[PDB]
Amino acid sequence: AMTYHLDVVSAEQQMFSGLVEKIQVTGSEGELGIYPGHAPLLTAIKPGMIRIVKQHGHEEFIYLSGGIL
Amino acid sequence: NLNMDLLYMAAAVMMGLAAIGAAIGIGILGGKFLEGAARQPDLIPLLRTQFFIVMGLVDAIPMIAVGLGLYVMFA
Amino acid sequence: NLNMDLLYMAAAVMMGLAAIGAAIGIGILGGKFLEGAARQPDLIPLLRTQFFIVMGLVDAIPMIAVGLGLYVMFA
Amino acid sequence: NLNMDLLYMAAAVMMGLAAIGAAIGIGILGGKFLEGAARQPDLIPLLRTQFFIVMGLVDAIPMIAVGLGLYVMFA
Amino acid sequence: NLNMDLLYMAAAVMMGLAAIGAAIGIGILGGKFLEGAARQPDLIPLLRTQFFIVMGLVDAIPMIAVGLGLYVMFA
Amino acid sequence: NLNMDLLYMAAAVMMGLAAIGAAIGIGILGGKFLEGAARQPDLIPLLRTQFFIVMGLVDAIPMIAVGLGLYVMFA
Amino acid sequence: NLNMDLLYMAAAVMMGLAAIGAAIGIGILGGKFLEGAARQPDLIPLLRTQFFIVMGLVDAIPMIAVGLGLYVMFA
Amino acid sequence: NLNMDLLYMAAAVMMGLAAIGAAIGIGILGGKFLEGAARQPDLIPLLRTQFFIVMGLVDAIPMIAVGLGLYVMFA
Amino acid sequence: NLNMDLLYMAAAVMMGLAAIGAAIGIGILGGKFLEGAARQPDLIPLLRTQFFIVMGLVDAIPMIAVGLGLYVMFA
Amino acid sequence: NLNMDLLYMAAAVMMGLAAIGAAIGIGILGGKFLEGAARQPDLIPLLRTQFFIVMGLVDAIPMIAVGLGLYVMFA
Amino acid sequence: NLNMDLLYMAAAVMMGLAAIGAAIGIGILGGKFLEGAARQPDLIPLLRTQFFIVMGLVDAIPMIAVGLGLYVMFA
Amino acid sequence: MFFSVVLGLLFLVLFRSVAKKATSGVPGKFQTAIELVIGFVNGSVKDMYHGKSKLIAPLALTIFVWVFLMNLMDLLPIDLLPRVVPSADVNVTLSMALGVFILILFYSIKMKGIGGFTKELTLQPFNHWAFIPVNLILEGVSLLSKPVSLGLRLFGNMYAGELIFILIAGLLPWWSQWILNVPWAIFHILIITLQAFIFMVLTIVYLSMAS
Amino acid sequence: NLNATILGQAIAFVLFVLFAMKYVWPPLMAAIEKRQKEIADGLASAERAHKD
Amino acid sequence: NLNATILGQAIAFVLFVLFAMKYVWPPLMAAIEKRQKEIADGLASAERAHKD
């Protein structure tokens, strides 16, 4: 599901992008409710795959290397 | 006389002091609702029903105290 | 005399001690409103109504205590 | 008379003051549930059952107080 | 004599103990105002009026206690 | 009569007021369990047993109070 | 004698217990002032006046308690 | 009679109210253990023994209260 | 006799219970001073004077309680 | 009889209620020790001695209360 | 007899309940010392003297309560 | 007088026992793990000793040494659980000599160091600060008491708690429970003695640090 | 403790203290001092020999 | 109804005698030989070192 212009960048080049209404993962803090409508905040995440409702109900788990978001 | 005097003292004791616990507890819950919604606005329709459930359970403890108070006053 | 003395003691007991719970609880809520709005100013019109609801529910617990107090004084 | 007066005073004492502890404690738990779910929405079905268990254990302490109150009133 | 003695004891009970709740609650609110303004200075004119509203609502609970105290002393 | 009246007053005193401490303390623990699991979900099977141990130790303090209450009522 | 004895007991009750609320509340405010200034030193001249206002409002609740105490002792 | 009545009232007073302090204090410690282990799971075998020491020291304060209670009931 | 007995009971009541509020409040302030200086060591000469002001204002509330205690004992 | 009855009531009052302050205070300290060591494990041998000092100073306040209790019971 | 009975009851009241405030307050300070040193170990020699000052000021409030207790017992 | 002089005698037995075992021991042997524990005790004692640094240093070491050492004295009575007044004024004995000695050592840093030489001026502007001289005067009063006050308060406090565990163990018809608590009570006792040495090093840090 | 008994009771402790002062403190203070300077000493000689 | 104390104290003294004596003993011995063997070992190897 699309919401809030969800982009994925990396140094050499941006990783990915989209609008994801829900991003299903557990923040480095802890379980992170996939949501549109979260506030201005700073985050980082370890490597791993996070399903996300991204544009038009397209929810996918995407492995990470560790990185910041 | 002594029994009637004891009823009125007992009614004051059971009514007021125990009801302080929900006066505080209902407020604790609404403070959690306000702080949770301020931190994450999208979670409002999920946690508002939790706040209502929780307020009613906290309010039931004084209503028990008030019940004993009214029994002492009128039963 | 003994019954009248018991009424006045009971009125003092039920009026003052229980009302401390909202004196604290109304303040707990407004502190949550102030801290939530300071952290996220855009959430003000969402959480202000929550604060009013919550303050009134906390204030109702003492109003119960005050009600018993007035019954003892005047009923 | 003196024994009956003592029952009614004792019922007020045991009913109201102890029940304040769950009025506060039930609220403490629901505030933790609301704040935990606001911080991490995916953990809702894990911690909601914990909140129910915990509320019931806190509510059992007043129900003990209420039990003594009712024994004094009616036993 | 017994009724007059009961008035003076009742006045002490209702005046002092309940007023502790706002002594704490007025302070809780001002601590939230100070911490909120320290974290976000631009939100000062928004939350200062909230602090005043909230302080007055907390102060009204003791003023109820004080009212019962004065009734017992002078009514 | 005086000894019997003292038993019923003493039962009310020891039963209600002390049991407030676990009503609060059982809730404090479950709030820590909920907040700890919300922050770090993988630590659930490690800290749940700690919560049970801790709840039972807090609940034992009132059960002592309740024991004295029942001795006064029935012993 | 009974009325005079009641005055002295009532003076002790209203003076000491209610004044605990500002003893705590004045301290709560100064702790918020110290923590707010430690986190953001540039906000000192903005929040220091808030601390004074708030301390005086909290201190007024005991001064009410003390007033009733002095009335009982000397009026 | 008066001495026996005083024993039973005194037993209720010393047993219940003081034991609230550990009911709360044992819970405070277990909440710290749960929150500390949730934040840093590798520190579990270091802080668990601290929690046990600390719970036993807090539990000793009520056991003192209970001791006085039992002396009043049975000594 | 009755008036003298009332003085000694009243002195105990007003002296001890109200002074708990600063015992807690003086400590709350010093905890804020220690935590503020630990977080930001350069702010020590700014907040130390605030801590002294605040401790003295909190200590004045018990000194009021102690004053009433001494009046009851010696006036 | 009246003096002996007063001793047993006074022993219950001074023993139980004051000892709640360390039951809570000993626990507050151990919670700080556990949370401090969880956040920074290398600081364990520095803060453990502080926890012991602090627990003993908090425990001395009840031991004063217990001392008065034992004087009333046995002196 | 009545005056002597009042002394022993008054001694129990003033000794135990007020001393709870430092039992808590001494612990609050040591918890701040432990948490401040855990967060910033280099600030230990700066804040340890603050903790001692603060503990002694909090401990002086009960020593006032204890003083009134001893006056009632032995003066 | 004769009555409950027996308890004073018990106190004597324990105290002197420690006192002689000391100079007996330095020559030999002490033990295979003997050298080890000699190290942990002596050395750690020195580590905490500063703490003080140097004021009482030789007598500081000897001192806290005798604190735990002689402190095993009433620790025997807790083990007794697992006439009727053997340990009574022995516990009171330890308490008394304890708080007394506390104020005494305060005087040691007072004359030996300033200290009391400085304490003649300890009235100080602290008495004027605080414009009323009773500010510093009074603070110092509560302090001077508090050293022997908390000192002995803890001293007979521990002696007493020991006694309570003891009698509790004594009065039970089926007494296996007394065996159970005797372990806990004993742990409490060790806590007491080590904590006593702890009080010693605290007064040391105070003492060579200040006065 | 009827008279003078509890008195001598505390007296006992005080005396043991002083006896520790004169003889014990000298012999034993130097005694633990001796092990300290012992392991300390040998370890020291160790280090120097190696380095030089 | 039976005395019953010394039994529990004694059995706990057995199992606990084992656990405790066991726990402390090895550490303290390894501390002994740790110390003597410490200043020692260093001194000796360092003697080989200096001499050689």
Short mmCIF file of C-alpha atoms in Angstrom, two decimals, chain C residues 1-2 4-35 37-39 41 55 62 66 73, chain E residues 2-3 6-7 9-15 17-26 28-29 32-33 35-37 39-40 43 47 50 54 57-58 61-62 64-65 68 72:
data_model
loop_
_atom_site.label_atom_id
_atom_site.label_comp_id
_atom_site.label_asym_id
_atom_site.label_seq_id
_atom_site.Cartn_x
_atom_site.Cartn_y
_atom_site.Cartn_z
CA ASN C 1 -25.17 14.89 70.00
CA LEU C 2 -23.10 11.76 69.19
CA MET C 4 -24.32 15.04 64.93
CA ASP C 5 -20.62 14.90 65.99
CA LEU C 6 -20.18 11.78 63.80
CA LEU C 7 -21.74 13.61 60.83
CA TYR C 8 -19.25 16.50 61.13
CA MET C 9 -16.22 14.21 61.52
CA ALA C 10 -17.43 12.00 58.61
CA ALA C 11 -17.93 15.07 56.37
CA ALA C 12 -14.30 16.15 56.96
CA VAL C 13 -12.98 12.59 56.28
CA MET C 14 -14.87 11.99 53.02
CA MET C 15 -14.45 15.52 51.65
CA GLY C 16 -10.71 16.09 51.95
CA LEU C 17 -8.73 12.85 51.58
CA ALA C 18 -10.45 11.40 48.47
CA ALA C 19 -10.33 14.77 46.59
CA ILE C 20 -6.48 14.57 46.71
CA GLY C 21 -6.76 11.87 43.99
CA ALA C 22 -8.10 14.27 41.39
CA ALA C 23 -5.96 17.15 42.56
CA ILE C 24 -3.11 14.88 41.47
CA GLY C 25 -4.97 13.19 38.56
CA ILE C 26 -6.16 16.41 36.80
CA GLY C 27 -2.53 17.62 36.98
CA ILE C 28 -1.16 14.31 35.56
CA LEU C 29 -3.32 14.74 32.54
CA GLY C 30 -2.41 18.33 31.87
CA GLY C 31 1.25 17.44 32.22
CA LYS C 32 0.76 14.77 29.53
CA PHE C 33 -1.05 17.31 27.30
CA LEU C 34 1.78 19.86 27.71
CA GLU C 35 4.56 17.30 27.14
CA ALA C 37 2.15 19.11 22.47
CA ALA C 38 5.76 20.21 23.17
CA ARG C 39 7.09 17.04 21.50
CA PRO C 41 2.84 20.62 18.10
CA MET C 55 -9.91 15.68 33.37
CA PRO C 62 -13.87 13.69 44.00
CA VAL C 66 -17.83 15.84 47.86
CA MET C 73 -23.35 18.00 56.30
CA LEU E 2 -19.23 17.13 71.68
CA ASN E 3 -20.68 18.67 68.49
CA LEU E 6 -16.34 17.33 66.28
CA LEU E 7 -16.54 20.50 64.16
CA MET E 9 -11.54 18.00 64.45
CA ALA E 10 -13.50 17.72 61.15
CA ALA E 11 -12.22 21.14 59.99
CA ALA E 12 -8.59 20.00 60.51
CA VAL E 13 -9.22 16.67 58.67
CA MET E 14 -10.93 18.13 55.58
CA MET E 15 -8.68 21.19 55.30
CA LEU E 17 -5.12 16.18 53.86
CA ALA E 18 -7.11 16.83 50.64
CA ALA E 19 -5.17 20.06 49.86
CA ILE E 20 -1.97 17.93 49.53
CA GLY E 21 -3.39 16.73 46.17
CA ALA E 22 -3.14 20.14 44.55
CA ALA E 23 0.07 21.03 46.30
CA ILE E 24 1.44 18.09 44.31
CA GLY E 25 -0.81 18.56 41.23
CA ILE E 26 -0.07 22.30 40.64
CA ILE E 28 3.24 18.46 38.34
CA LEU E 29 1.82 20.83 35.81
CA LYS E 32 5.54 19.72 32.55
CA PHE E 33 5.43 23.37 31.38
CA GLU E 35 10.25 20.59 30.66
CA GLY E 36 8.10 21.16 27.52
CA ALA E 37 9.43 24.70 27.01
CA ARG E 39 12.69 20.84 24.98
CA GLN E 40 10.89 23.10 22.46
CA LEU E 43 5.86 26.16 21.91
CA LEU E 47 1.33 25.60 26.31
CA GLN E 50 -2.80 25.12 29.02
CA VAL E 54 -4.77 22.98 34.29
CA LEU E 57 -8.66 22.89 37.73
CA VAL E 58 -6.23 21.14 40.09
CA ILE E 61 -10.24 20.28 44.20
CA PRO E 62 -8.57 21.77 47.42
CA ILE E 64 -13.63 22.28 47.67
CA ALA E 65 -11.78 20.80 50.70
CA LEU E 68 -15.94 22.18 53.71
CA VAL E 72 -17.24 23.33 59.64
#
